[PDB]
């Protein structure tokens, strides 16, 4: 939705009039994982179904002996469920933010 002007000509032998068009640093897969860990530990997310804290140290210990398998599934497949739903999300992000028009679908 940006006019995306990328003219090529200029003053003779100018080499000016660059063609910058994307103008938003779309971050790579290799870096986002940082933000993903930051989030998942800020508790905006959660595992699919995770018993947070067992009743007592007995059931907690009996669940720590459990050799989990989500270990085996890689980082980028653990199906995280949500903690703050999109509707609420629209109500808090101040509209000044340039992504506000995506909170609402």
């Amino acid at each position: 939705r940006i006019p995306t002007v990328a003219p090529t000509t200029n003053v003779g032998t100018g080499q000016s009039t660059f063609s910058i068009d994307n103008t938003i640093k779309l971050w790579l897969k290799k870096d986002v994982k940082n933000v993903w860990e930051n989030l998942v530990q800020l508790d905006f997310f959660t595992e699919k179904s995770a018993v947070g804290l067992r009743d007592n140290a007995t059931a907690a210990f009996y669940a720590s002996n459990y050799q989990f398998q989500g270990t085996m599934i890689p980082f980028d497949l653990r199906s995280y469920q949500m903690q703050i739903i999109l509707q609420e999300l629209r109500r808090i992000i101040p509209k000044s933010n340039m992504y506000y028009s995506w909170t609402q679908l």
Binding site: I85, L86, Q87, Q104, L105
Partner: protein
Amino acid sequence: DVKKGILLQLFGGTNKTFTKGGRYRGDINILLCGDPSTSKSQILQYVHKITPRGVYTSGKGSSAVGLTAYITRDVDTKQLVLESGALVLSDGGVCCIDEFDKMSDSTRSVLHEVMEQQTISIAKAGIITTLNARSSILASANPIGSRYNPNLPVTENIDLPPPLLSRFDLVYLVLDKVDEKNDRELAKHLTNLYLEDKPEHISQDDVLPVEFLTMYISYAKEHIHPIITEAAKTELVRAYVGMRKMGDDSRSDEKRITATTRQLES
């Protein structure tokens, strides 16, 4: 409230004619639905009798041609004749339509045009044309099955697709209750009319001008043209905004009826 909406249909709107744009459907259109045996069809009879131009009509016993006149290239003089527009007969004044759900999907498509532009653009082998039929439809209905399912979403309980539905200026839900408080009142309200031989004024005995009101209507619709003052504009805008923001949701997309510009037109 059904009666109220009907009355407001009778006086429908005013013809704001623009030199640019134009054809802003000067009148309104009222579906009404609810539990079977709830006076809907009889209200329709009653209105159709009231207005001096009504054209009663059933659904599923009628076709697109019946709804919107059909043209014929007469080979006698090689000309354009139009025939039997049920909708065209109702040019000015209301119409009525029953079993609106039971209407066929092949039909119930000419509405998608006439209701919002009051024109019918026919284009068949011989002729293309656009016959304007200004007319305030007034349809009954029947929710799917034979009553509500208050475990079912409402805009699914009504069958009609959201475009055609929002087309309707005003939708009523005449729900039947198990009150037992009005029930005996209704029963008396019937038994009394059965008491006499020629029953009149079935309801409370308050004078009301069964004949005078028609000339009253045919005076009102022709001597007064409401100009929307400034103050009205504000409260209208805020009313619309509040209607729509309320309708806002993420899961309102598939099941709810969304407030759209036709809400403001309404």
